């Protein structure tokens, strides 16, 4: 596809970039997007949860009552789950929730998300910019000029740009990401996607086909 380029003042610059068709104009795979999103949210998990089973309780293993003759239910030791304060049966155990997805499946899901953004027309290509000093107001003005300051936005940068990151840190509906670390969840989680020219070049080079 072809996208016009805006400066940081919100005005069309007359320059145009070409987005790779094999990235931005493919038929999206909804099942692939589902799988990639699920894997991302599973990898974020820290499954630190546990309860005490019978072998891990603190009571002694002594038979509480004699087997026959007392006239009540037969009883073993005090750690039984039938007793109040007894064992937790089949409670949680520490777990690792990561699983495997094929690399080609992940690439397909990434391209499906990008194609979906392009088809629904939320991709804005902007000129590369730098800040001499960190300043939240300047980044806010850039977002307002690009008309992305209402809903969630994701800016994609070609490199670190520490001053820009510091400027965008405090804004609540703004996310930043490097071009080479683009993933399906992050692309889909934001309403608007903003790319720079160098970011477009990097994405086209690195995620094609």
């Amino acid at each position: 596809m072809e996208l016009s380029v805006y400066n940081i003042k919100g005005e069309d610059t007359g320059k145009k970039v070409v987005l790779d068709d094999s990235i931005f104009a493919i038929e999206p795979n909804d099942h692939a997007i589902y799988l990639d999103v699920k894997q991302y949210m599973a990898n974020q998990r820290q499954g630190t949860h546990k309860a005490k089973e019978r072998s891990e309780l603190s009571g002694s293993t002594r038979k509480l009552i004699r087997q026959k003759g007392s006239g009540g239910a037969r009883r073993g030791d005090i750690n039984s789950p039938l007793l109040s304060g007894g064992a937790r049966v089949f409670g949680p155990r520490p777990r690792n929730y990561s699983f495997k997805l094929n690399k080609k499946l992940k690439a397909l899901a990434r391209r499906s998300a990008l194609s979906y953004k392009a088809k629904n027309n939320e991709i804005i290509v902007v000129e590369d910019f730098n800040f001499d000093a960190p300043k939240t107001k300047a980044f806010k003005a850039i977002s307002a000029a690009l008309k992305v300051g209402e809903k969630k936005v994701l800016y994609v940068l070609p490199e670190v740009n520490k001053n820009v990151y510091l400027s965008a840190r405090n804004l609540p509906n703004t996310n930043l990401i490097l071009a080479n670390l683009i993933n399906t969840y992050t692309v889909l989680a934001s309403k608007n996607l903003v790319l720079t020219e160098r970011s477009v070049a990097v994405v086209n080079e690195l995620f094609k086909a």
Binding site: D30, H31, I33, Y34, V37, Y116, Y185, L188, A189
Partner: protein, 141 residues
Amino acid sequence: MNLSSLKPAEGAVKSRKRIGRGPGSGLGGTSTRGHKGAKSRSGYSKKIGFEGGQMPIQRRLPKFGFKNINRVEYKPINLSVLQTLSEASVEDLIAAGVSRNSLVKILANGTVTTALTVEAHAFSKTAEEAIVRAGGSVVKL
């Protein structure tokens, strides 16, 4: 779709079976186990190769044969795939485009019908006759 309207493919996810949770489910009470006996108890396990005390088949039958340690087994390659690789050269034995540092034996199932010099660890007599008839050569090394 976005994160708010995710949908798996139809029939991709299925709910698990949960037993011992009431009459309406069809899986409560005895919870699919039947009534009594060994198989109804917690911790029952099947003894593999056990038939109730009758001498099992894996003891009734006799042991046979032996396995050679230094068995030289070749990977078979046929004339049909030789000709397929030839039709996009005349000098085979590249074979990485397969194997991975293996011994290759050329066998005769299809037909070469070309003029190729093939290097391989082994050939069959039929394969040699076929390649020479089509006008080829062998390098058995």
